[PDB]
From a paper:
The four antigen-binding pockets (A′, F′, C′ and T′) of [name] bind the hydrocarbon chains of amphipathic antigens (Ag), allowing the hydrophilic head groups to protrude from the F′-pocket through the F′-portal. For example, [name] tetramers carrying a mycobacterial glycolipid, glucose-6-O-monomycolate ([name]), demonstrated the existence of polyclonal T cells recognizing [name] lipids and among tuberculosis (TB) patients.
The glucosyl moiety extends substantially out of the [name] cleft and can exhibit mobility. TCR engagement caused two major conformational changes. Namely, the glucose headgroup was flattened by the CDR3α loop, being displaced by ∼5 Å towards the α2-helix of [name]. This bulldozing of the headgroup was essential to enable favourable contacts between glucose and the GEM TCR, and also enabled TCR contacts with the [name] molecule itself. To accommodate the altered position of [name], the hinge region of the [name] α2-helix was remoulded. Repositioning of Gln152 caused a ripple of conformational change, including the displacement of Tyr151, which caused re-orientation of Phe84 and Phe88 as well as shifting of Phe144.
Residue numbers in the entry:
A (entry chain B): 3 to 99
B (entry chain A): 4 to 283
The structure:
């Protein structure tokens, strides 16, 4: 009955340290629709994150895109944190260039 | 013509308990959002200057009034049905309705509804058709709905008369954005793959519009059949991202290239070459 989200973290452009880019977190295949998504920089919630309005696929699974401008560096860690009824606790998926 | 060929409206109505339900709605051209539904105002948000297509302000307001009345009436009807039947809270209902322009010019309309993420009903040639997944509950719902005067008639007009003229008007109004050409960029990456002496090569392709694209791993002119296409992922601002992977034996990656063909490239395919020994 309930469907756990798939979480995909990717950058808009190939990563280059010091060059501005966009970090995307695509959350999909989940049911029901209620979900909490945050983009993190070094384990802290980024405030300037935008997101799509709710939509769903042909099989009725919901999906959302969360994104923010980011300037990757050698040290900084970025991630997507998701909470949903199907998850025991928030699931963190790290961005890996 | 290129770009989207369909318009649809979607509904997600979330029922928390017998007295509390909330609806989210939006309008789309294929995967591109053009309308939002503002629950604070009971009106539509027009996301593009051309989102009203060739419709007058009066027709747009009459349609918003129909959706406003529907969203209110629907929640009340479901809460009544849920009580009469074996429905446990919380539950979610989804709906999708719209039309699409096919090759040859025919416009086909559709309406589908779901309960609990499973098919529940559809509208096939102006009547309510229960889906087998919906079982007896869908049969009773369709029989109840057709008893309410004017409903099926309003559905028929919206689907078969209003939607087709709307779609044509909006595909023309939005053509400069819908039929625009945006060039992708591409890059390579690699990593270990399951099993001894296996490598996975990845060809990333990002920023292309419209959606149709061709990406393949190659050895000279030989297309590698083993190329696996990932699902096309969205970027913000109406562009797409795709990963095309190839599993190869270690020591057999040299000689591989990734070729990208896209409508925006004017016949200049992107060709990336994988190099061994960390020479990427
Ligand atoms: C928004 O745009 C819609 C689409 O417009 C067309 O496409 C866009 C992209 C632009 O290129 C436009 O310039 C272009 O018009 C409008 O809807 C369309 O309106 C036209 C013009 O009224 C209409 O054509 C009429 O069609 C009927 C036949 O229709 C039936 O049969 C066809 C198959 O053959 C079928 O596809 C239809 O669904 C119907 O079953 C025909 O009898 C008419 O002929 C009469 O008029 C012409 C002059 O126009 C004359 O030469 C003839 O001799 C005769 O008197 C005429 O050809 C299209 O059918 C219609 N398209 C659709 C899919 O509905 C839309 O117009 C408004 O709605 C219409 C239904 C009609 O009531 C119009 O009066 C309205 O303005 C427009 N605006 C809005 C608000 O929707
Ligand atoms: C610019 C963007 C625009 C895009 C344009 C494209 C067109 C979109 C095409 C997609 C089609 C969208 C379909 C949405 C559904 C609209 C339904 C309208 C109903 C109202 O109608 C209806 C509202 C009351 C709701 C009653 C609860 C039942 C709800 C279950 C309906 C299931 C759906 C049917 C499937 C079997 C009504 O009974 O309302 C009162 C009516 O209006 C009065 O004026 C009239 O006098 C009365 O007799 C009627 O009863
Ligand atoms: C104007 C701009 C457009 C934005 C407005 C948003 C539009 C929202 C309305 C969408 C209508 C979708 C039509 C699909 C109807 C859904 C049918 O619902 C069911 O299947 C009922 C399920 C009943 C379960 C039993 C209780
Ligand atoms: C239903 O849920 C709402 C919102 O969570 C709450 O305010 C309300 O009092 C609940 N009512 C019932 C039927 O118990
Ligand atoms: Cl497209
Ligand atoms: Cl080589
Ligand atoms: Na978990």
């Amino acid at each position: 009955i309930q469907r756990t989200p798939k979480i995909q973290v990717y950058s808009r452009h190939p990563a280059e340290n010091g060059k501005s880019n966009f970090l995307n977190c695509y959350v999909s295949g989940f049911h029901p629709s209620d979900i909490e998504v945050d983009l993190l920089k070094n384990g802290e919630r980024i405030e300037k994150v935008e997101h799509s309005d709710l939509s769903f696929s042909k099989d009725w699974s919901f999906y959302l895109l969360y994104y923010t401008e980011f300037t990757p560096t050698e040290k900084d860690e970025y991630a997507c944190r998701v909470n949903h009824v199907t998850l025991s606790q928030p699931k963190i998926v790290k961005w890996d260039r | 013509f290129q770009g989207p060929t369909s318009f649809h409206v979607i509904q997600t109505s979330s029922f928390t308990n017998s007295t509390w339900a909330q609806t989210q709605g939006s309008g789309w051209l294929d995967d591109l959002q053009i309308h939002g539904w503002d629950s604070d105002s009971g009106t539509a948000i027009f996301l593009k200057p051309w989102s009203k297509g060739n419709f007058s302000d009066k027709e747009v307001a009459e349609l918003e009034e129909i959706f406003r009345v529907y969203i209110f009436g629907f929640a009340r009807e479901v809460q009544d049905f849920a009580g009469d039947f074996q429905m446990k809270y919380p539950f979610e209902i989804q709906g999708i309705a719209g039309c699409e322009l096919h090759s040859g010019g025919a416009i086909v309309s559709f309406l589908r509804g779901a309960l609990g993420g499973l098919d529940f009903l559809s509208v096939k040639n102006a009547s309510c058709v229960p889906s087998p997944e919906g079982g007896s509950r869908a049969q009773k719902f369709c029989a109840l709905i057709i008893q309410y005067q004017g409903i099926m008639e309003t559905v028929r007009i919206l689907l078969y008369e209003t939607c087709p003229r709307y779609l044509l008007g909006v595909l023309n109004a939005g053509k400069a954005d819908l039929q625009r050409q945006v060039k992708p960029e591409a890059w390579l990456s690699s990593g270990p793959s399951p099993g001894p002496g296996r490598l996975q090569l990845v060809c990333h392709v990002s920023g292309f519009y419209p959606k149709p694209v061709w990406v393949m791993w190659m050895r000279g002119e030989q297309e590698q059949q083993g190329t696996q296409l990932g699902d096309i992922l969205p970027n913000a601002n109406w562009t797409w991202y795709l990963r095309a992977t190839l599993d190869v034996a270690d020591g057999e990656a040299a000689g591989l290239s990734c070729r990208v063909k896209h409508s925006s490239l004017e016949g200049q395919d992107i060709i990336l070459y994988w190099r061994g020994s960390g020479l990427n």
